[PDB]
Amino acid sequence: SDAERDALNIETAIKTKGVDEVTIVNILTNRSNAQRQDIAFAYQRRTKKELASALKSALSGHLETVILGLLKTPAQYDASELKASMKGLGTDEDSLIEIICSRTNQELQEINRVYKEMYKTDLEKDIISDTSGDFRKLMVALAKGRRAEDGSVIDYELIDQDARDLYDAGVKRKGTDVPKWISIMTERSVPHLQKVFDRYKSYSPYDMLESIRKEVKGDLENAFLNLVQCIQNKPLYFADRLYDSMKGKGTRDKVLIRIMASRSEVDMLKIRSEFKRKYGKSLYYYIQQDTKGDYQKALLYLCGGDD
DNA sequence: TTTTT
Ligand SMILES: [Ca+2]
Ligand SMILES: [Ca+2]
Ligand SMILES: [Ca+2]
Ligand SMILES: [Ca+2]
Ligand SMILES: [Ca+2]
């Protein structure tokens, strides 16, 4: 791909009668995030106008949402989707939960950095202002992106202690020591907590998910359930969420666009394998059945192929 | 335009 050739073709398509939405999708959804930035700079040189702003005026509907997200860097997109979710008077806890629970340390520290630059306040402060209680404690801890990294020697002794501790703090006692749960689950490494969750099955008659459902409710319950899935198998999590966004009446397009756009160059192939092996048909197939038009062709290129 | 009541 030639960034200057693409910026030219995208300009010719914006200026074709009715807008040539097809050429725009073919290019942009078939280029890395770096190549999209290149195109966006080249466009700005040929025209002295921002690509993002020209496309907002040229497109509409779901297609516009997809393509303007694509034009953002990974940290910028996630940052913007965290602001969108915390905007207005209410909060979109689900979207918040999904982005925070599923981002790595490296991803979270750049999001924290870029969020400051775009919106002139700190992500933490914006989280504190829109969530309360233990759900705020959990979200604040997760968003620091400071969870311990995997050691070289497995720490079997602490795996057992942590599993015991999760149990003492929950299903065993009356009430719940929620901060014990927040500590263990925000601070320990992902490979470690994978082992904890299995060892926990040794003490408790319920597994980690059952125990969450039986111990807390509401946002806190959702925050912990998403978090355990992301620790256990992150591509499976995104496949399950992709399925939920499409399985019944209509489409939660917001979730479908966000996963396809943010996971396309990260783990889309792993997501597709889990979706196929659990649901029997491809992620590609569910997208084809649920959406129409340029919008559909856009999500399908992000998918990257039928399974 | 995108934040902000
Ligand atoms: Ca428009
Ligand atoms: Ca809000
Ligand atoms: Ca209890
Ligand atoms: Ca419950
Ligand atoms: Ca549907």
Numbering used by the authors: 33 to 339
What does the published report state?
Annexin A2 is a non-EF-hand calcium-binding protein that is characterized by the ability to bind and aggregate (i.e. ‘annex’) anionic phospholipid membranes. AnxA2 preferentially binds to phospholipids and other anionic polymers and does not contain any canonical RNA- or DNA-binding motifs. Importantly, AnxA2 was shown to bind phosphorothioate oligonucleotides and has been implicated in the release of PS ASOs from endo-lysosomal compartments in productive ASO cellular trafficking.
From our crystallization trials, we obtained two types of AnxA2–ASO co-crystals that were used to solve two structures referred to as structure I and structure II, determined at 1.9 and 2.4 Å resolution, respectively. In structure II, it contains two copies of the complex (complex 1 and complex 2). In this crystal, the electron density indicated the presence of double-stranded nucleic acid that was formed by ASOs from complexes 1 and 2. Because of low quality of the electron density maps for nucleobases, it was not possible to establish the register of the ASO in structure II; therefore, an arbitrarily chosen dT sequence was built in the model. In structure II of the AnxA2–ASO complex, visible nucleotides were located in the vicinity of loop AB of domain II. Notably, this loop is the equivalent of loop IIIAB, which binds the PS group in structure I. The PS linkage makes van der Waals contacts with side chains of K115 and K119. In contrast to the distorted trajectory in structure I, the oligonucleotide backbone that is bound by the protein in structure II adopts a more canonical conformation.
